[PDB]
RNA sequence: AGAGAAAUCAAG
RNA sequence: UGCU
RNA sequence: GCCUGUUUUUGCU
RNA sequence: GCAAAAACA
RNA sequence: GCAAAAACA
């Protein structure tokens, strides 16, 4: 449960963290992308800023 | 017209957009509707026989005519009973999945139909006030009439409503008591006449016709009955290839394209209309078709009786004559009833019932669009016809795939005759067949290689709506966006429509030139920052779907300090008169009630600047609905199912809310003390 | 405070009772009828009054407020001269919103962010898509229903109301409603609407959430192999004259669900009568916390295995017949595509029966591949006409050969051999290679003409000039697109073949044994413990965890497992057990220990610790033993094959840990001593008054405390779930009764 | 007057 | 009292 | 004044 | 669910 | 966001 939220790191990335934890527990260190991963790794951030 | 017929770059099909005088005024009707109503009454009698014999046609109850009596050189009113039976049998034998869906609807969907669906209608004739009233008002007063004449409560289902309607017909005298106080009396004959009465009235702002036509509206005593048959007809039509009425928009175009397969030697394409529709269709033919459908389905007798009630009531219809035919002595103008002095409608005097006139033939009104479509489609099912047919109500398109031209002509004539067997006459001047297929029209959709976009069918929607700047801008831009998506408007037309709409929208809100609003903004140093305030457009062709405020915030055109003021949920401009309830996700108290305002300060309400008891009753219903919604958050997501009456249900709910409020016990006691 | 809400509700109830003495004698269920009575909001032609209405002296109607000055800089902002009603009656000047744009009270930035949340999502979604290069060109539209806007989570329509109920008002729900809700969507929606519900009313927030999890498909003309997955950008990225190239992936779990369904189908085809095996397994597998039936209903994809599993659950499938890269759709046909068991006696001992499919009677099939679009008409195995709408100079080798294979038109293959037959896939590959290097069968089947108007060149190219042209191949004169009118209902074969109900028989749609797809990742959160195929997991840890959760939590499964391992009988988990334990020599000692533990304690299958010990002994017993080594005593603990995970008999460490308070299997607390629901709950009672047991706040609140009796509230009724004492579920008892009836019927 | 078209507005 |  | 049926767009409960 | 608008028959 | 006199995203 989130205590402090920062605008730099949105609290929605906890979904990415828990997905990675579950995938690693299931013997899969590498997992497919999810929607919360969009604003977690700056995917298409260069194009967004440029446009 | 030579300027509308290009020969080199584009074809005339693409220039069919130019054959539209829209953006010009739409014609209106001015005077008495009596002549039009009487003409619609007399036309079915003129078409029953090959030689018009009106006097010999008025004594006919069921219009059934021998195959040698069917007119082939003109409109033919009536049907062939054996033809209807055999064609309905053929239509049932084929399209078995459609009949299975009909059985599914009868068993499952029909019992769950609620009579509140009748409230969705527009102006409805009221048998109590003898006027046209909004559908909710007429429905509620009819429900009260049934409740206080049957001394019982009417179930929410439509079957219970129809059973109550049938039960009231069994009484000798019925009374209506309503607040102004006033009491009105109905005999069985009087209430029967009011049941079978259609209120006639002009159709205004109708484009595409030289002569004004008359529309009619039935009472709530028969709209419920028509609802069942219309829903069943829709259920059947959604599952048959030959129908075109229940689908619309792009789905209708896809269905049409699924049939534009021209592979044989001679591939025709017949597109035409049916003349004198809604008045050459005897309701008894629809009765027979529905009865055959229900017999071959194994349905019991009660459903057959229910399906047959509306068509008999329309067989006994009483069309409301207007305020009289116009008579002149010199340059005088006087309006007189039908039977006062001779006219061209003297043969119909015997059908006059007060101010209404009876007509046993035809439908007189498009209350059975889906059932008439089914009647048209059953006639198609025969061995001779091998082409693809699409029929909506009276506009049809047919595709032929024949080896020889003579075979195609024989098939076309067989189509005409089989349509005439059930009382449907092809309009000879409106039906055109192209022997090599590829060019046609259906529902004003012209196709040559693909369904070409039709500009000027979207122009009437380009005017600002007049609610408030945000809603007007949003819906105008989204209408333009839908027109672009459907192919009606391309890039250039879409952008030009955006510019025209924006300019008119800024004008309508006093944002152009020197106005009072602009002067006030100038003298007080108020920069616009919004489209409705005179700022530069933020929306583009690719950003039609984006909200103005969000896009301006993203682009930096609207700073956060002004955003904190525009989107204030406590602004006086859009403040509500009463407190509203709010959810609280994962909180000790999940519901909080507090005063609220619409977030945008530009979503204000414009004053409109100018059966009363029933309106106060609507207000009481609204208050009860509001308190129920406040106390029962779960009826907002699912249907209400709590037991008991409203008072006790909300009393127990309010209690249970209190004991979960996490307060002191004695405080809960003092709160419960003042509950009524 | 919290008391103000109760005060307001009490006063509203009292006023509504006093002001409306009637309208509450009606039943509460009459709300569904009288909520629609909202007349006096009707208006006619507001657009014909806007110009005058704005220019009226006092156009704006608002409630009386003191935040708007009566006169500001010489302009009279508000008018209170008339005050006919004095409530919602004062009128404001048109410049009042303009005045409020400045000189106005502000609001926290959090509120502004919450209000613009969905619109901001749309704006960032627009500015995050790669604006590619415009490719102008003539386009043949394809009309299909497409999703209006993207959804944070896709949920089947039946589960949307329950999801919303769990999001907004959990206190007025039952355990069945909670079970029918998509909990992932519930969590996402709660996180999203935590700030939004503070600025939106109840119904506004409810329907915002609904829109966030509702598909709302709408028909639009699209471009083939250019579907933007959502009509949000169709005006920008698509038209009849251009498309904007974009690079967007699926980012959806439909591929993983396909992988899971494919594994289930492949392992089900290896058993007796695969249909009921697949149906039973699909009713015992849960992805995350959602049952497999519900997640299959959620994902309505085009994929084959997903379609097979959806048909097995009674749902529909959108899959279309695909050959290589060309999609085929039968517009209309006289009879379903029949199959011929062409047996090939090339050798006496070596013979293979390779079946092909063809047409009988007349048929018309639409085909699409890349930008090539059109239809062809055939009679039996003879092509009558072909009409193609393709770009100029395009190579039409692969689509035409896919058509020929689809109709079995050309006859070098199918009934013949063009060379010994061996397997379907090899024969198909040989067919395609032979006709790729020798594409003359099409020309000798269709014929040649010297007319220059015909666009199909002898080298199977579009509009390229040549001396001769392929006969009966013309341009697509009018747009043609598949469309089904009647709601198609699908039939699943006993060998897991998906059929479509054609008029004169059954039309094959999906057929395994030629669906070629490599293995992929399983969906996260997949639970195969209750299923018969645990070896689907490729991880030894997951395999062992699922097997142990299956044995520990259920006594009957432990009985069956121990019995099969001890007596060397066939077991559903033989492969998993063999793959978990290394090649050892402890089988005889394990079987012994099984013997003494069974004889000493006939009542062993009630203590989960005893079940754990018996499961360990049975797993070692059913292991792959070594021949050339003498048997040794069973060890206290061993290591899983190809792993460093320790499995211990005493369950003090490693994969299974059984503390006094609880048992942990693979890091997860499978069983709790006093607070748990392993055997589940049953409803047992619906009442209009509270029963004589505790009333929990929410269904999940009562699921955590683990009381022997608790109630929940749902629309004025109380549902008091107590406990399940039966050792079997409804589903398998119904299965047993149905099989007993059918196993008395067979004589 | 005029607008207009199968009969209305141009007052009560 | 101000739409190109 | 302003019917029935289908489709579409927007906003609010 | 309601309200407004538009197209077609 | 990382990082500093502008590169990655």
Curated annotation (Swiss-Prot), chain A:
Location(s) in or outside the cell: Virion; Host nucleus
Assembly behavior: RNA polymerase is composed of three subunits: PA, PB1 and PB2.
Family membership noted in the UniProt record: Belongs to the influenza viruses PA family.
Function of the molecule: subunit of the RNA-dependent RNA polymerase which is responsible for replication and transcription of virus RNA segments. The transcription of viral mRNAs occurs by a unique mechanism called cap-snatching. 5' methylated caps of cellular mRNAs are cleaved after 10-13 nucleotides by PA. In turn, these short capped RNAs are used as primers by PB1 for transcription of viral mRNAs. During virus replication, PB1 initiates RNA synthesis and copy vRNA into complementary RNA (cRNA) which in turn serves as a template for the production of more vRNAs.
Name of the protein in question: Polymerase acidic protein
From Swiss-Prot, chain B:
Alphabetical GO biological process terms: viral RNA genome replication
Domain RdRp catalytic: 257-432
Catalyzed reactions per annotation: RNA(n) + a ribonucleoside 5'-triphosphate = RNA(n+1) + diphosphate
Pfam (any one): Flu_PB1
Keywords: Nucleotide-binding, Nucleotidyltransferase, RNA-directed RNA polymerase, Transferase, Viral RNA replication
InterPro entries listed in its UniProt record: DNA/RNA_pol_sf, RNA-dir_pol_NSvirus, RNA_pol_PB1_influenza
Entry keyword Nucleotidyltransferase: yes
A molecular function (GO) term: RNA-directed RNA polymerase activity
Family: Belongs to the influenza viruses polymerase PB1 family.
Complex formation: RNA polymerase is composed of three subunits: PA, PB1 and PB2.
Function statement: RNA-dependent RNA polymerase which is responsible for replication and transcription of virus RNA segments. The transcription of viral mRNAs occurs by a unique mechanism called cap-snatching. 5' methylated caps of cellular mRNAs are cleaved after 10-13 nucleotides by PA. In turn, these short capped RNAs are used as primers by PB1 for transcription of viral mRNAs. During virus replication, PB1 initiates RNA synthesis and copy vRNA into complementary RNA (cRNA) which in turn serves as a template for the production of more vRNAs.
Name this polypeptide is given: RNA-directed RNA polymerase catalytic subunit
Curated annotation (Swiss-Prot), chain C:
Primary location group: virion
Gene3D superfamilies hit by this protein: 3.30.70.3510
GO cellular component: host cell nucleus; virion component
Keywords: Cap snatching, Host nucleus, mRNA capping, mRNA processing, Virion
One GO biological process term: 7-methylguanosine mRNA capping
Compartment annotation: Virion; Host nucleus
Residue ranges of the motif Nuclear localization signal: 745-747
Record family assignment: Belongs to the influenza viruses PB2 family.
Known role: subunit of the RNA-dependent RNA polymerase which is responsible for replication and transcription of virus RNA segments. The transcription of viral mRNAs occurs by a unique mechanism called cap-snatching. 5' methylated caps of cellular mRNAs are cleaved after 10-13 nucleotides by PA. In turn, these short capped RNAs are used as primers by PB1 for transcription of viral mRNAs. During virus replication, PB1 initiates RNA synthesis and copy vRNA into complementary RNA (cRNA) which in turn serves as a template for the production of more vRNAs.
Protein name per Swiss-Prot or TrEMBL: Polymerase basic protein 2
Source species of the chain: Thogoto virus (isolate SiAr 126) (Tho)
